[PDB]
Amino acid sequence: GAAILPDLGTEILIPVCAVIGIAFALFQWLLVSKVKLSAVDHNVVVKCAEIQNAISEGATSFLFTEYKYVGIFMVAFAILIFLFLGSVEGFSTSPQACSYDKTKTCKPALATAIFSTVSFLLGGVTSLVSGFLGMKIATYANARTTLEARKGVGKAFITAFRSGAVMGFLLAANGLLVLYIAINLFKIYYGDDWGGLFEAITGYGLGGSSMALFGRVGGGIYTKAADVGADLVGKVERNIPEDDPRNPAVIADNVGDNVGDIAGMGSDLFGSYAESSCAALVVASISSFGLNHELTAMLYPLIVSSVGILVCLLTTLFATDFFEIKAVKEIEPALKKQLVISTVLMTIGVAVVSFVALPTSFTIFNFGVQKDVKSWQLFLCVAVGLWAGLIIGFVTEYYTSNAYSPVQDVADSCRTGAATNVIFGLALGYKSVIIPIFAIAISIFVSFTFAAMYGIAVAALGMLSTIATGLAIDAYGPISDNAGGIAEMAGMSHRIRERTDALDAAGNTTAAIGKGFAIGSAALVSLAKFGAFVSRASITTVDVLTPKVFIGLIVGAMLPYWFSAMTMKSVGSAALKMVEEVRRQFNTIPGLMEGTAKPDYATCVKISTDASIKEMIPPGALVMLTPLVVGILFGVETLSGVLAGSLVSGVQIAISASNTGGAWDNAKKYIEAGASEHARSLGPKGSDCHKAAVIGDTIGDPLKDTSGPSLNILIKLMAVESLVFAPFFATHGGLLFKIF
Amino acid sequence: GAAILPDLGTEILIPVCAVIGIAFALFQWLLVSKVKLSAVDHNVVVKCAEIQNAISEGATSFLFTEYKYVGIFMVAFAILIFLFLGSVEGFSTSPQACSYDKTKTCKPALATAIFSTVSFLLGGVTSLVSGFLGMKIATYANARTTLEARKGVGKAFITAFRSGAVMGFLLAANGLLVLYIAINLFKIYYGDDWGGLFEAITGYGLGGSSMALFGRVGGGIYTKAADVGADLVGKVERNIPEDDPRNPAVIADNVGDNVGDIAGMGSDLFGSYAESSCAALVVASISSFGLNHELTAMLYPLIVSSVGILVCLLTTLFATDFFEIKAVKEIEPALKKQLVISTVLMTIGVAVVSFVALPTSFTIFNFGVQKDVKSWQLFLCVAVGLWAGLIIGFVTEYYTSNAYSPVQDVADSCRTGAATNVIFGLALGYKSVIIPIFAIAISIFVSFTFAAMYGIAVAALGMLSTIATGLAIDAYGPISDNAGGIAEMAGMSHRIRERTDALDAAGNTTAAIGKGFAIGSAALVSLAKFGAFVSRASITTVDVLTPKVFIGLIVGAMLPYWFSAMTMKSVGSAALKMVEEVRRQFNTIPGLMEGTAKPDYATCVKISTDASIKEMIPPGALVMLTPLVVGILFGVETLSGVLAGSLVSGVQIAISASNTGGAWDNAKKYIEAGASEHARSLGPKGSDCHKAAVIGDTIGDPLKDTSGPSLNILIKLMAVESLVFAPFFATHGGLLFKIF
């Protein structure tokens, strides 16, 4: 029945660990505030602050524009949720029997329609705040990482990493806390109807991933229109340094790192956290924990997260205080040791939590039957997910870091042109999918066998128990991107840019690694949500060999490709506008190409703003309308196949897009760095080889930064949407099969 | 119930229609031999036949080397079949209970292990023969297409199309006649055990696709290494023309067209035909047709194929006689009309066949249950697949022909370089999969609903009911591509090359449509085989939400990407060697660029021959070993997942690769033609736009001619293989689930 750790204990521990998380985050922002600068060498400090202000102004300006739209959609959609969910029992206010225990009476479905809408609003608002806070810290840390670079890599590393850790700890504690609050608040109303309490809390992950979808796509098109434009004309055509202040797209480019790579990624990861936690919660609510009203075991996923924070705080110190970087070859293994330490520390942490938060025996809902599960079996569920991440990390690294042969052979293929560079890169990413799929598959088999959907939901959360650390090394990247962006823009020494370029390359690998973690955990959470949807829809069997299910499967597998076609073409078209505008300024503003005259940055901000804001609508629509269109016309059996098909298919293309993109970026950085005979013999910057790498890198730009990373939101989003609307689809769905 | 057509009337009709087709082929070959030439204006006539022979020698050279390896593998594999299938019943020689009716007695399992092996070898040999024959007629008419180009486009077209029709009718009429002989020879032994007759006959399909796998990959690696290397040093670096006899890779390049695009393509479609016929047969054999021993209706697939030949013969006469081409703008429509005509006649053809060769009611095996099916519903099954092919073709043409916006917009994007070209192309291909997947899915729903697995199989055959026309227009492409390369190597007038390039661009679109049909029917056949596998393996339900099935599903979905990574990196590495070699000759043989000295052609053929033969092995291994590894270690449930996932996932990347690839080619052709204001504004040849387009085209080379077209084989092979080994798997597989 009960576990060692009493209910009230859990009620204290959880928000305590959140608060500690926010305290840590603020203490770090404080230490970062020690690096001083203003716009009132002395000049080089002033030039940094004026550039940093351009970016900060530019990124706050876009997010307000984007969130204004997204926020309107969020309201429209909350109405739908209410209407559709309320329409099931014809908006009755009368209680009915608990579908999980006919002897008992539950709160009316109308209530759950209402609280669903509230938890959705919470989830979406929290997702937006995650993006916004992430940008605010990144637009603050960027130039301070520039100034500290004067003292060498190791000092710049610290302000970039301390800052990344600001975002990670803020995001993780805030999401943990909101969920915690929402639960207790709702419980005031639901009392003993824990089934309906947690059914309403599922809106939270729906809100999270909904807003994230637009955040990622909008911020993604914005930033990559800029990037591909600046780089092509600036580097391939006009033969000037990357991020040169003469280049009119340079401000949009660096703003982009903050509205895409940081704000978009911030929200994306919030959704991953929200859904996984919520998937664990719903399965539990109709399992022995929820049925016996055992709060501690019921909140087991929240306790794992609480301990994850503490664990991640301790891990952070190893990079923050117990180790100084002195050479550039030490930067990555620092970042990589962050992963290894937290994984190892969390394993202990999780065994402890498994030991004191669970009863040694209990039951997990398994498609209508209470399965007998043991607490050590549950430990292995979260542990197999946790370690699957680390594996994915190691392998992604091997495939995206220019310290290894795969990428160096990609760089080396530039010797015969761009075409070979592109062929090697594509082949690289395809190859990269293999071990992660295997890690995902193993992870699924173990956790599925032990505790059905709950095991899988808990595996996903295992993969994100170290989410604070994971976020820091991820947010470290774009900060190091801006930092060398400001260095070049402020005409600082070549020795500064050399350091930032080592940081930036390190952030390239961790960018792909975090992408791997998002794909992996999104496959786990999707599979949990899918299987939960099936029960909720009163489906008896998802049988691949029925006509309804199979058409669902093959069409669902096509969706990720449809989505990719849209996002790619969007960037490809906006980048074409950027290139024309950049050329126009170079060819018609006298004095520009010789640094005597100033470029018009605002036009490039205006081109990327107009395209991202407009073009984030159709792919947002495909993802959000699909569950609804399919659920209503074809019904829940066809929807089942669609959920399965987009998972097994989306995952393949997300992984290879992100890795191919990463491999091209770092292949380029390798040539740029000339830190070996081989690398030098490919250089120098401007050579035919370097220009092949730049082409490859720019094709990879929208792959790894718009399509690739958003595809994991597609997969995990369609599953919560389906699970949430399942009562409506079960009852009013499959019209086409009814009219005929 | 029996049909209006008597069994004897069917035993006659089939080989008669075969022989007609074989006659019509022999006729067309002779008519083409009217064009006279030999290696003994007229100065140019002897330079052509000098080149043709260099091509024919080297093509025949490679196929022998390739087939040596393939035949060995074939003999080895035929043993595994005997051994595995033999060990089901412990190698007993006594009869046993029928697998589809315990109340009845069948022929011994060991007898079927033998006939399975005999049919496999039949299929393997008929497959290699299909590739080799196609190579002959191709390497025979290529120079004859060059020479006839001196008298307008419309008269070079004819010899090309006739010669294509030679290969079409030979391959269709022969694969049918070998199957018909095998069925009748086998019937002698099996007597009333029709169930075991057609169970053994399925090895035919396994034979074809097995040997087509290696032909495509090996013949596709060979050809593209050459293609990419030649084009890059030639057109991008040294600014010399495409197919310039100074370029030492032009021979391997033009040999490659016959060795890959012709030989590898003929085996591919044979395997498609064979599997579709067989799948129709194995289901029918345990349905009322085979149970009641009704030979005519039993042989319904072979009857449709027969009428198909006649229809195609009629249809072929339209483009080869009573309709002539004047404008180069008439070529594509002439080919496109071939499809429309044959589809329309064939719809009348199948109506007739359905009317006189079926009973009006019968039963179709439907997972252990005889399902009531009406003749007119079977009519719709083959019809839907027939029309879905036509739909697939038209959509393919829209995204691949430079007569429409998608490809024209892709050419446009060259104005901003190779990077935007590639981004636009990738996005086009992705975009291009939507409608074809909808077509396939609609076929699957309609056919599955009417007649279960039988319908699906009969739909696949419906999509290949006009295989001779389809093969005719498809084989026409590589004949034309060769024809222009001989013109350029003979040094003939540029009046000529603009005619051949018209042919060649038409052939380019055609090749993509061929690719669509192949994938479309592969998807359908794979589903039928998959469904037949499930019954044979005694699986009650393929339930998605079970661990064994899901890991099967996600890992299976990863497979076509693994395969891709191999085939891509292979071409990429061989192309890198090619470029270095061409560079070496140009930089070390004096007078070579000047046209005084002669290049070492034999070295380029040697780089290709080495790469392909060595590198076809692993992708082959992956496809053949997967059913065995999963079937043996994991069991039929998991192998069910792998079959579902690889179909569903593989089809997407198959379609998008072939289309992206075809699009980049035709965009480059658009610019090299200069037949419009827009076109001319991107030229001339040599420009930065033309060069960016060539970058795109050579990246697309391996996507559309190595990976893409082969991926469709991966799907239909793994399915039929699994079906053949089903009894062995069901009995002796699933080991890791038995040890633990």
Ligand SMILES: [K+]
């Ligand atoms: K990065």
Ligand SMILES: [K+]
């Ligand atoms: K062709």
Ligand SMILES: [Mg+2]
């Ligand atoms: Mg860039």
Ligand SMILES: [Mg+2]
């Ligand atoms: Mg950037």
Ligand SMILES: [Mg+2]
């Ligand atoms: Mg950057």
Ligand SMILES: [Mg+2]
């Ligand atoms: Mg970067």
Ligand SMILES: [Mg+2]
């Ligand atoms: Mg970039």
Ligand SMILES: [Mg+2]
């Ligand atoms: Mg070529």
Ligand SMILES: [Mg+2]
């Ligand atoms: Mg060719």
Ligand SMILES: [Mg+2]
């Ligand atoms: Mg050619």
Ligand SMILES: [Mg+2]
């Ligand atoms: Mg061609």
Ligand SMILES: [Mg+2]
């Ligand atoms: Mg080519």
